[PDB]
Design a protein that fits this description.
Helix content of chain A: 10-25%
Subcellular location (chain A): Host cytoplasm; Host Golgi apparatus; Host nucleus
Number of helices of chain A: 8
Strand order of the largest sheet of chain A: 5-4-1-2-3-7-6
Bound molecules: the ligand O=C(Nc1cncc2cnccc12)[C@@H]1CCOc2ccc(Cl)cc21, chloride ion
CATH topology of the largest domain in chain A: Thrombin, subunit H
Subunit structure (chain A): 3CL-PRO exists as monomer and homodimer. Only the homodimer shows catalytic activity. Interacts with host FBXO22; this interaction promotes the proteasomal degradation of nsp5.
Protein name (chain A): 3C-like proteinase nsp5
Number of strands of chain A: 13
Shape of chain A: elongated
CATH superfamily of the largest domain in chain A: Trypsin-like serine proteases
Strand content of chain A: 25-35%
Order of helices and strands of chain A: HEEEHEEEEEEEEEEHHHHHH
Number of domains of chain A: 3
Oligomer: homodimer
Distance between the termini of chain A: 11 Å
Structural class of chain A: alpha+beta
Organism (chain A): Severe acute respiratory syndrome coronavirus 2
CATH architecture of the largest domain in chain A: Beta Barrel
CATH class of the largest domain in chain A: Mainly Beta
Radius of gyration of chain A: 21 Å
Largest sheet of chain A: 7 strands, antiparallel
Chain lengths: 302, 306
Amino acid sequence: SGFRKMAFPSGKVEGCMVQVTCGTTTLNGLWLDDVVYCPRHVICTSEDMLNPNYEDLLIRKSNHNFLVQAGNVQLRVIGHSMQNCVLKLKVDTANPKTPKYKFVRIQPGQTFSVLACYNGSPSGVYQCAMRPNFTIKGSFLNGSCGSVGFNIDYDCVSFCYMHHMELPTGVHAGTDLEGNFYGPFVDRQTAQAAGTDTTITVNVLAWLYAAVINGDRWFLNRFTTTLNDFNLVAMKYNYEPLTQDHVDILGPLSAQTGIAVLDMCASLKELLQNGMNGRTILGSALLEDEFTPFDVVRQCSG
Amino acid sequence: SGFRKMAFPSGKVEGCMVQVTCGTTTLNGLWLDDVVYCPRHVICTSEDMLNPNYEDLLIRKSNHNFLVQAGNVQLRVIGHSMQNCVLKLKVDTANPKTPKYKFVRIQPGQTFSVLACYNGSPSGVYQCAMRPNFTIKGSFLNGSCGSVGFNIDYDCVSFCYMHHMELPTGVHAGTDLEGNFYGPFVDRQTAQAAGTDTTITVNVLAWLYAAVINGDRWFLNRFTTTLNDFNLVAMKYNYEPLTQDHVDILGPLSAQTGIAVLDMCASLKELLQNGMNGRTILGSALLEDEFTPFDVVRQCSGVTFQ
Ligand SMILES: O=C(Nc1cncc2cnccc12)[C@@H]1CCOc2ccc(Cl)cc21
Ligand SMILES: O=C(Nc1cncc2cnccc12)[C@@H]1CCOc2ccc(Cl)cc21
Ligand SMILES: [Cl-]
């Protein structure tokens, strides 16, 4: 019993965190095999950040301009290349702690663990979701760039995010491990803003199924809804549209609890209309949207 | 910017998790130096749990009755003894991944990270607090016994909790690593219940300071209060009493934000008496009490653990 915002154990990723320094700038790098991945803005000074020409800034650097520190050991950079917004530094030592890993680009609504780091040293681990507006609501201070997001389903680390920047609203933007930004963001100091965010409907439904699995049914009602009528209502509360894919994905949770997906949608419609009336659901007075259907099944009893 | 429920990096503890099997029961053990610590109830059948005589149940076991698996390697148990509600299995190999560690008993209100494990394999990490009623609001399924709670202070892992049981309300009970239970609980299948809980006042104040640091100020007001008047309101709302020690501990956050501790107490008093009026604080509609003043300072300063 219980339901917590649970992160993956971070040890496999801690053994990959290194410090990358280029001139006066220091940030984090991810050391996998003989390559260290980090945000390409490590080659920029604060001045270069409005309209950096990364190809021009990079051509001026030699391997010895990159200082990579792994614990108390300096690694030797023997090559460098840029892939999109990530810089890849080839080093002369393969990381002996390299776990089984893959690079995966995720979709909005997907969750992942973030290992926040400073100076190549891990500070904390927390669970995040890629918001519908392609930002993440992280907890990052100056020096956290290059911290990564990941999942560890079945012993393989799937790296899905590398931290690059904080937007004016205090939310965060980054890339996948191939250096492609999530969303319409650029690694430039030019005026950029997070778009209007919405609630991840499929995740709220998954979390209502988690509440039913954990013994809470107060919010259920005798009604059902069509998928279209649900979407017309939910969008009035700034909820993402629920697709037939989301309905299919919720099938296993629907079968386990005996509550049809559109019946749970009717419950959600009623919660949006009524609020909680002084009650809580899984210790929350708000509808939680940072648990996916997969997270609920993984955490909850069967 | 941002403020998340953040756990310590778990790698140092992951390297200590092992699987302990005794007969039909499998649970988790903590392998530090040449000893594996686990709940003593690993030796009980379901019927033994009804009224166990642990000394008597243990005298019937030999070292070979305890199968300890560290990853894909079977460790050899060469001794066994009980300390309170923990069983200590001496093994023939010191854990090469043993971090610098201590065993510490925490007080209610203190937070810690839990590394939830099943079959000696870490599954997740989360943060929680020792409630004033000595339970933890954990997330644990069957097989999670022996999962541990810890803090990291500098390069030292302070182990403070070992999971033993789930109470009927779905909250959890366990011991320190010396096998002493937190709370008036016993390791027996008998009627037990979590007592009425209270809110950890000093932690709510710390989280209000975290909200101010992160740019949320709507709850601030021009008022102040005395510690006695604030404590009268705390008692009324099932909040733990705030001591002068708690005020002193909140001193740094008070100096940073410019909001005196008793000034923040008047904001909390108003929140208790009036509610949030449709507003949220750090994305929450409830007053959060599972961040200590130290957690707030640590998260807002970026302290690392290499
Ligand atoms: O966002 C950035 N720094 C940080 C990241 N995350 C959290 C933080 C918190 N507080 C200050 C700084 C932070 C850098 C510096 C600002 O301007 C830019 C512009 C583009 C890029 Cl790609 C990075 C940055
Ligand atoms: O609580 C216990 N098991 C678990 C712990 N945590 C979470 C769980 C979730 N779901 C089922 C079981 C769980 C065991 C089994 C029940 O009877 C007792 C009685 C005393 C003692 Cl010390 C332990 C136990
Ligand atoms: Cl995805």
